[model samples]
Target chain A: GSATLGRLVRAWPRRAAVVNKADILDEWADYDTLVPDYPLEIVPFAEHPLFLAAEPHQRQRVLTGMWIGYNERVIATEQLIAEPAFDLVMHGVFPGSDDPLIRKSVQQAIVDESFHTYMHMLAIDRTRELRKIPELVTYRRLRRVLADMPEQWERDIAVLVWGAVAETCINALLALLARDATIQPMHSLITTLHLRDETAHGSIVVEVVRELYARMNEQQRRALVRCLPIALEAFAEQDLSALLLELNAAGIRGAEEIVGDLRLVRDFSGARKMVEQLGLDDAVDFDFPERPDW
Target chain B: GSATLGRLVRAWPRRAAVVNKADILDEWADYDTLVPDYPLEIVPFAEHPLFLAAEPHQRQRVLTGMWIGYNERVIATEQLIAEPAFDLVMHGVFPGSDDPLIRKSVQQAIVDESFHTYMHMLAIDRTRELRKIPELVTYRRLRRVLADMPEQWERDIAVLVWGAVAETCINALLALLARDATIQPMHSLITTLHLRDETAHGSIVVEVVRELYARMNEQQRRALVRCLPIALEAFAEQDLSALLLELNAAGIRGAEEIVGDLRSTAGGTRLVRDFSGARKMVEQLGLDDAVDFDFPERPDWSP
Candidate 1:
């Protein structure tokens, strides 16, 4: 937290200047003109007809859902930033050490996270306004996974561990999205801002994990080891059932079949790449648990 | 932390461009030419003979000591910036709080404190090189006070409360110094930089005290109240024993009598002035109108 906080407050550049919702609307006049009707050629899984052959509005709906889902997930984790149980554990675990840097670093992450949430919500809101799409709702899988934890202490640790994994994954995912200018201009712009903040947030999570490892007892270490793979799997898991339902509700034909094909073709390589990017893949040592069966 | 940190990082102006050690010596060639020899007329207690009639060199030595003393004392408190114990207390004391601003503000204070220490050290170093003054040492009275505490937990709280008081006082005192351009150019220059940072540091300290009060339980609150006056007295106390000793060692006549006179005449008005400033500070922080203290105020001690 100290190192990352120092780097962020000391070295990171200010947020980039980007056109807002109003500016984009004034320029493009309509959502279709602002972004292409079909997914870009560089989009992931572009080979699939589900993505390539979808109508312009159908594609927009999915894109809107993607943005909403991410924003909602980020919003859900906001509780962890100030959780009483988590704060208590950290307080007792660490002694009266002065370096207020760590706490401030965590605070920076919370601020950036809040801004990231705000950015995506704006995207979702603007898209809804620009296109006559139905109000989209995003299902949160991480919350359900967390709710299953029996003890508050265990749950708190899970939040940190899982949060670390999510933030790390976000850096990589946003980088990919931000690089694809072929997509909606606002989509890339939003990802650019999210990526900037997540870059710092990812570094902070690494520091947090390092501190957690340093302070954890033998039992706590084993508990963390046991849960590390669970978090990895949870982070990788996507609720395609809801996405498929959204697609069906949007009047796309054979949405179930398309989603079924997606499930069969889905691979863990992307998930592995994220863990590798975070350098946690090898750090955990024991074979990481496989992705929970879809 | 967040608010202060944001302001410092985002809003506060960067450090001013000053000629470093190499620049002053190689370019100016004379220290006296760069900064005045005599003390600023408005300097606290300037009327005292201990200050008024001394030789140019003797006056310089005393002034040097004063500058070195403050810088050293500030550096001595560096440990509190990153203490594990304080971190733990604050972590549990405040839960998922949104005030990253406060934490960052404290972080900025730590950074500025470090810079302030560096600036003074540079001043001392340059003076030693330029004037051939004897090597000087500063005693940290606060550390001694902290060591005297019975328990580590209580000791930790003492460090914060006392540290806050000291920082608050330093801001006012430095402001007094910086306002007097009649002093050496470098003196005011250094104080200007120090004051810039302290303005933010002092604000952070006020915020720190406010948070401390809000989070303290009844016992903790009582503990702080008890330590408050001790911290205040400690803030006001000046260990002129070293200065007096230095003066005598420097072959200045009547050094003992001069210091004695100083001890008797130096009143708590300067302290009262600081307290009064703090009272305004407390008002800004929504604190009580007065410092509800029970400790006796020592008016005759030299600051």
Candidate 2:
């Protein structure tokens, strides 16, 4: 543990350097006004006939609404989901979490997450004013899942696993919009810096898992085992609930039909990718559902 | 209402430019080890026999603890007291509150408060790590006050009034430590930017009161009238609960004796600059007869 601490004592600081650079929200100012607020490619039904036939201004409304909607989801994920895991680590839930470096790392992440909420909020607010569209936000489904968990330990493990999955896949999720030259530069830049921060955020969560999983009792271990799939599945759940409403609000023709076709699939590939990369399949002694893709 | 709304349409945007300058928290990073984390003069018993005779290191602990303690109180006050008003406004509880600019201003303030909480939390954490002292941080009393109030409307009015008093006096509340060269540069810079944000914060609250108060029922009006002094007194209370414990923890010689003497005097509604705008609010809202608070003379004459 001491040897691991020696490495992390160094690792946490360097990772911190890469993580805590939210100063750019202050530095960037040129709002070029011409580019789309979100990546066209990321919107799942963008290629659909109704969306394709939408008027130019309607399409623009849909795009900006998409950006605002995405920020709202990530903001809730950070505050509601990721922060529970942070709270655990800070409370010394993991075995080696008492190390000053570990405590300090968690504090750094808490500050970072709070700042991230502010940043994402600014993103939503800017898009709202710039595009003049309002319906961009809810966490009721996600909160219901947690609230329905009968056991405290089950809920914690579920939260921990879900936080890990979300953060681990966050850069991949963000990078599509970030690298898109077609979106507004500042919008791209918001994701660009958000991606930089989550690398360390992922590292922090993984390290929490490594130490915490070892300390779990059998009942707790069972909690962990059952929750791995639950976390990923829910994290990657195909609820286009927001986009569906957004499309309708955009007055896209056949919005229901457009959404209906996409309903045949809800991909958890991002979830699968994280499970493999984080080794949850091996570590939690569970098999991935090899028979069918969601 | 439209006259005020038209004026506010321009006011909120200009006021916005004046607020929301927490960027310097990112910009400033030189943590000089020499300067104190808090101002010595602000400590009521800084001149007392025990604190005056304490070892330099002990004094240092008390000073940093004061900084940390102050942050905790203010942080608690924000999350507990001020943000309830933010949520209320965002919920469009006030008449004329649904204006997009009004909503945006409230949101801008909300974002800034969230940012402020982060900054203050960072400040507390930094001071803790730097000083190696653990006790740097509650709104229990304020919560208790609200919990004891049976009426929901009464609590709501109380909370809004408290939030108004807080934001109104916030700039003056912050400026003392901010202007003190005796404290660390970064600490001063943090409050300096905080002061910037709060100017608009006070404006937003005052604006809310004008619209909201006009729409209040007789009972709600009476509630506002009564809550005014309660808000100011509690906000300005000299509850040195944290500082006393911090003093004892620092192993300050005769900490109790020092605290004991200081207990003889707990002065004023103007530990800040008399909450001047709050008084103005009562007058303009025409609650001057019902709402009675003696705005004491400025306690600290010079900055």
Candidate 3:
């Protein structure tokens, strides 16, 4: 888990980006739009409304649980971006989601999260059976509920959001976690199982968040913009701590401090650009904008 | 999720056990009662003091959360036992842990977990500084607080007891988690470094519960015994499900219904006998005189 991210990223363009000539549909085709030689199967993105509309409470609780779970996957995956194990965790999981394997894996993971969200939808549908629980009602319309909540509820939401951030930070070490060749199979297999469908869900999140950030009113945009630093700093800091801890005994002085230096040396400037482009620049801590309650 | 119990139990002991020699020692020894392998060099076991001492509301909540976390680990571990992947997950890291050449790496990993626990304990201790929080307390004494609570609080104690089961089960797995030949050198080094110390904590949980069960008052014994069937069943049922889901696309039929057959077979009896720790809980918990839990028959081979 202690592998440097710089090494993984350096290997990316070589292994992940290069297309097998025989696997390419067209050499001159745009990388973004070009279809690959691999056949793409469209499985029904089954909406579990079949289960959700009837039962809301169970669905709500499970989804809430999944929300935390998926967030964990994200942070952990991101941590791997700079960590050594990213290669084992992500690659080979998605063969055709996109031109580059990384983007394809990212896209595939997004789809998995969406399926997970659908499961939540199903659970929420189940929760309608327990009409007595006030929390269940708020959960169905979480956006509005979160906006109007007094201190306790707001704190809970913040904590949930924070939990998402925290777990994502943990998961970002996927690359580093894969460094051990012996455990590489374990790392590869467990995550690849999930990434099969998750890639699409990740794409959806990035796009949806991107569109929302673009379309938000000025005040909302400003609030979102403010969240960027904390999110980024928190990401950087958490990962650095993990990396430092992973390598502390390896003779790096002031492990935590060295993490920041390692980040600087790695030209993770792409991460900053990624934040800005993703509209994460406006996503200040605990600053989610109010949307109409569903 | 539909992997039946029959398949789970039928294939229970198809392979050799995955555990380290030290873990073997810890498992058989009176974990809590025994002297350290290296006398005086080890720290004695202590509960997370802050967690044990919190006021009723926070105390119960945190304990419940921790207990739930521990149970989840237990459920996961036991379920893994029936899965085909159990050996790989358990033994994937074993050769490294068991190897003398990798002894240093093993030592390092052990040290890291030990120190990390200490760090977490310190953080918990700091929580007492908050005006609303209670001071930290020890695990053995925490039961006294639970006894003082209303009947509703009893469930929480049950959950706390469950935590001990998880401690023992994980203790069973630790020797393996530390053993991956392919584990990063640093990770292997750090984890193996502290195995002996963390094993101390595991010993406490395993022994206390063993003693608690060995000498339990009828009611407590009955409650625990009653819970075990359902707990064990849930654990058995879930194992199949997780395996199926994991292998759905991979086309593996690992979660087939084999548990029922095991119950009817002579092999099951041998399994019960060889499980080493099974059927002993009655005497271990001292419920023989106070309450009776008919230890299930150790069924053997079926025609």
Which tens-of-lDDT digit does each residue in B1-303 have in candidate 2? 335434543453344321333243343467678878887766667767778788999888888877887787666667666767776766556565666556645655665565566567667766777767622112454576788999776787877887888777653437777777887887887777676667657666676687778887778877777778777776555555666788998998676677743322234223444466676677778776776567655445322
**Candidate 3 chain A weakest lDDT stretch, 10 residues:** A37-46
lDDT of 1 at A198: 60
Winning model by TM-score? 2
- Across B249-289, the per-residue lDDT of candidate 1 in tens digits comes to 55667776666423222432342324443443456545453
Which ranges in model 1 have alpha carbons more than 4 Å from their true place? A1-294, B1-10, B13-34, B37-55, B77-98, B134-153, B171-173, B261-273, B280-303
Residue-level error in angstroms, candidate 3, position B203: 4.4
* Angstrom error at residue B291, model 2: 2.4
lDDT of 1 by residue, A1-294 (tens): 365556654443243111112122233334464654223443334456766588867666766555555454444444343232223332434332123445445543443443344354445545555665511121144456567878665665666666555655543345656766676676776676666666666665566566655666665566666666766655545556555655666666777777778672223433355455445666664344444322
DockQ class, candidate 3: incorrect
Model 2: colliding residue pairs:
none
TM-score for chain B considered on its own, for each of the candidates: 0.70, 0.84, 0.33
Error of 2 at B46 (Å): 3.6
Selected candidate, larger DockQ, 2 vs 3: 2
List residue ranges in candidate 3 displaced over 4 A. Answer: A1-157, A163-279, A282-294, B1-152, B162-203, B210-284, B289-292, B296-303
lDDT (CA) for every model shown? 0.50, 0.64, 0.30
Q: Compared with the true structure, what per-residue lDDT tens digits does model 3 show for residues A1-294?
A: 112222332332222211111111122223222211111111011123332232444333333333233333343333222211212222222122122323323322322232222222222222222222211211223344346656542333232333223223223223322232432132322333333323222333233334434554664455445434444454443223333332333333344444455451112233333355564555434322232211
All candidates: TM-score: 0.45, 0.72, 0.28
lDDT of 3 by residue, B191-228 (tens): 34334434433333333345334444556556666544
